[PDB]
């Protein structure tokens, strides 16, 4: 799973992001809706055009959860158990969408911090995003 080494890489790239976390959370959501249109289906109540005060408001929330799962990377399952019911039970989000969001988040940190997303770090970050994805779809298996 998340090796002591992996945990180090994740925390590292999350410290170079720090303040921008929020901005990055909104950019990731915008790319998702643009590159993977089918995801707009889950946000019928949002103003999905670039800029929307909602997409930004939500992007903050998403980023915040990530930053918070990073501080509990030793127990991501418990630091997000609340979001599991919302995603798996109420919303019934198809598991594939999680791969999409994760891929867009990488594309983001790669645009803003290329020299930080070294192949070794990429490998770690991808394991970390998969964990989150798993925990949020946990009420499935």
């Amino acid at each position: 799973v998340l090796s002591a080494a992996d945990k180090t890489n994740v925390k590292g790239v999350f410290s170079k992001i720090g303040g921008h976390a929020e901005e990055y959370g909104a950019e990731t959501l915008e790319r998702m809706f643009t590159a993977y249109p089918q995801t707009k289906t889950y946000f019928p109540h949002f103003d999905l055009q670039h800029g929307s005060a909602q997409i930004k408001a939500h992007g903050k929330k998403v980023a915040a959860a990530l930053v918070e799962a990073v501080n509990h990377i030793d127990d991501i399952a418990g630091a997000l158990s609340k979001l599991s019911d919302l995603h798996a039970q109420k919303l019934r989000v198809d598991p594939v969408n999680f791969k999409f969001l994760g891929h867009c988040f990488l594309v983001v940190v790669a645009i803003h911090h290329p020299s930080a997303l070294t192949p070794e770090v990429h490998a770690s970050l991808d394991k970390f995003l998969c964990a989150v994805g798993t925990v949020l779809t946990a009420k499935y298996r």
Partner: peptide, 25 residues
Amino acid sequence: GDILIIVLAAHFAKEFTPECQAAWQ
């Protein structure tokens, strides 16, 4: 293909707009 997309994103930065990402996906 997904990795290629990430590599391209890191070589072009902001020039790699969301519409561009979508064109490449």
